[PDB]
Design a protein around this nucleic acid. Sequence first.
RNA 1: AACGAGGAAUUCCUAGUAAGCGCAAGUCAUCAGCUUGCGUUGAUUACGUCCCUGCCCUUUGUACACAC
Lengths: 107, 75, 44, 842
Amino acid sequence: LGESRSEVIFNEELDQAISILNDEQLILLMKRCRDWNTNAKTHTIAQRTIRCILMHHNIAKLSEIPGMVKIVDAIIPYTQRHFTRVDNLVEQSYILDYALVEMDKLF
Amino acid sequence: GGGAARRQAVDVSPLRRVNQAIALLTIGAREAAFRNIKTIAETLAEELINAAKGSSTSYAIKKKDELERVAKSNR
Amino acid sequence: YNVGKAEKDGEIRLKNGVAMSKEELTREDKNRLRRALKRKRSKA
Amino acid sequence: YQRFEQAAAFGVIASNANCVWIPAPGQLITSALEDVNIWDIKTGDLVSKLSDGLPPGASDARGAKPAECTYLEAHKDTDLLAVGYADGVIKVWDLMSKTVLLNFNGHKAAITLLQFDGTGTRLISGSKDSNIIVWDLVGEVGLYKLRSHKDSITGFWCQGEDWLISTSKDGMIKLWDLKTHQCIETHIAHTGECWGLAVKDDLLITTGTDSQVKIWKLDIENDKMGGKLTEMGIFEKQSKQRGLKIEFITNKTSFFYIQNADKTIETFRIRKEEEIARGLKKREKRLKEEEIAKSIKESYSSFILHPFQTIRSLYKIKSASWTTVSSSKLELVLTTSSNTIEYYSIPYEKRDPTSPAPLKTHTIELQGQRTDVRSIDISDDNKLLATASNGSLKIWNIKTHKCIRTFECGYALTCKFLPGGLLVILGTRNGELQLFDLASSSLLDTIEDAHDAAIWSLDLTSDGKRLVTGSADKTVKFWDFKVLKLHHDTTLELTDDILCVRVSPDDRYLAISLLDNTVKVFFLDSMKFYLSLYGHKLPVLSIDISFDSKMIITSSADKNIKIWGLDFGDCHKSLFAHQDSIMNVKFLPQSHNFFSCSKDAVVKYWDGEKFECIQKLYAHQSEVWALAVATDGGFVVSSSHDHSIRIWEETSLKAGERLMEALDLGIAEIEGLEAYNRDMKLWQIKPQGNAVLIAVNKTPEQYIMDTLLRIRMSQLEDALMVMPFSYVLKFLKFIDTVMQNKTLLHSHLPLICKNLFFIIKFNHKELVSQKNEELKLQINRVKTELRSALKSTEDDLGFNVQGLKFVKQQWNLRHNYEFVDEYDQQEKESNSARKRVFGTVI
RNA sequence: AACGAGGAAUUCCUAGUAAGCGCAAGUCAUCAGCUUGCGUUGAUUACGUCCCUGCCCUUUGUACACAC
């Protein structure tokens, strides 16, 4: 990620590796991805690997894969928590817009 | 200061200013009538008049001048 | 889904959701994690 | 209350050590215990030894067993000797003044290998615990540490300034790059434990643990695993027990030797390409008379290599070293386990040994007991007696520290001397007393069948007229001198074995142990069974009685000296000492003070009236076997299983505020470098980067971010409340800069955003009262970049949430069974939903 | 003839508190070289901080949301 902060998500060859992963390794990757999704300091990494998977596999297959909708079911609610907190942060970030208004009006 | 003590200047808050004011006046008149023919009423009247002038012949104004000088020295 | 101890043996998994294999730790770190589990289960 | 200090050490010619040979046969370095020794081979005469000045025994010394000297290797171009002691301490000696010039202590365990290039004065050390240190002798500091092995280090070969190749006691070989300063390559070598490593510029030869030597090809190619190390072949058939040391040598047919741990040693020749081509053609003609080429590729190893010969030397060897001459003689210096240092030579003409056997020259076995000392004796303050189960009764002069006569008597057990005639007596684990002369031959009257078992203890009365020999036949026999033969006269047949006997210096009591934890005390004059002392829970091993027949000292296997008073037969005083076991105890010849030597290498000196260990003596590191005290002088001679003879002679800031200081430094470097950028752009001199940023090698944003990161969340609101307004302006510039460095921004986006919004809500009145077009532009940049960051992160989150819900819904409407009746499916659902238990107070 | 409100050091002290002023009792231990009660006039200065000298404490969110 850090090197690819400058339609890709990571470096493209890495994306190809994730695209041609096996089913068993997809299960293992999503197990680790759910684990890192738990805390809120590694959620970005979890979200990016998930998005790379969803954009590079057959979704009917991903739904089909045995013993995975268990994992998916544990993955949604923490991502809603993160979504709500980040949206709250956009919300607080309109302060700067307020201060700019006040400063130009003084000016 | 670890052994090397030194006076640093700080500002003072009005309840402390008023408490100093009252203490300075009354200590000045009590020690000015410690042993004389004067008494507390007359020495204290002397002091309150002079200090309200600010005229610097009086106990409390001398001690005030001292303390702003010491701050002025090592701020 | 809370996170608790990993169902293999080859891993140690902490509470903040980070998991580490037994192999890929340097020996001092294997020491220090043994110390941490020592005192934690020493109370509980 | 005098104190004793060590004065001597004999018989310690070479042990537990790795020899370094000096060409002039020339001189040779071995180590004593705790000590080095150098000597000429052909004369066998000691030159020098190196140690710390204060001996063990001066009261300044520390209470610990001294460190054994476990490795040593030299540099003749600078003529220094780097030795390493088993406390993992490295000492370098000058060889001219024979003085230390510096020391080192970096390891923790014992040191295995020293290897060093004085060319740049690089010193390399590999200890028992797995790390390799590299040092500079000129700067005498620690350069660095290479650590990735797991068990130990057993071999490593340096090369130049670039590479190490090391092998461990767990069988993997590791190549280390010294530039990037770290491991590069690793290969498991043998199944068990690999031990030896020797390098020719082509090929690398290692040993396994069961006589499989393996042959790699080495290079400097730059593939990942490829190019570097490759797996040419397996040669074998040295012995069965594993080898330890391989060394190459040349003149130019080259040779190398494997030193094993058995009695033997092997030497091989390595051939040349002409013989290689010849054998190739001969083998190919055998091939013709494909897969057959695969077979010759498999017999590669035996094809190239060649078994030159062996030495079936004697019993056991520690170390070995090469010497070549004339292309017709190869020579091995050979340090054994037992006290011998032998020279070996072999003729050859680059074709053949031309000899039925290797030749043994120049042994050194003269002043070394060559086995384990079983007993000691002192004689008239001039004369010393050392006996060992090789029989090698070595007679010594103390003041010359040197041998006089040596005999042989089989598995000797106990020594004693006769001042009358100056004739020594010994006894063995077979019942045969052997009495020897000193000027003449040994055997004068070698008695046999004196006891059907091993004899154990033997003493003579204060005159020198009779011999009491207690022996494991459960019998003691009493013998008299006739004129010079010995005649037994009477036998006492007890019930159990005898483990010690002594008689009073006034000649009245006889003390005889038993195998039971008991000792009997008899009247000598008529054999009357005067007393029986009881109670050690383990048998008595050694007995003393006083200089004047007042007390009896008994020392046994359960580590407790007991002091009995002899008169009524009482136990004065018990004394737990010597964590292993006591072998013996002796009195001073004058007074009630006594020495005691254990099985765990301590000599403890007691007062017999306060009953305290006056002194503890920490000379050496083996089971002490015996002790004897001078008849007058107070020097005492202690002897122990390390083949060793010792003589003791008688003589700040607050969080928030540290953020402000970091903020000052960071903003200073940032704005200075910006002004310099403006300067060069106007042109078309670097303002100096400050010490902290340079020294930690941290860019300014990383510095300020690290101080912000270290601060804790309970102190973050207070800290940002503390700083004044000028520092807030600096904070805003810093946030602008990290928006320039996006990677840092997305790394620490919550920290930055929280701090920014708090510091602005708090300083809002100032902030709008400031009018600066710089500040407006800064706020536009910061606000737009924060929206960009937060917004793209959020967009990830929305996409993931929708997608995972869609995945689950799809799987539901294909797999999970569906009903039609509303109540029926409600029953289904309230079955299958997650149930979590919870502890309510009612 | 000794004395004109008691040196260095240390101790004690936050509201009917410090300090003054007298009256009364004498209670199975203690108390008359005195001890406990009872009223009467009645303040100056802090009421913050862990910076100093110390003194404890926790370093396993675990209890159940939400947040951190």
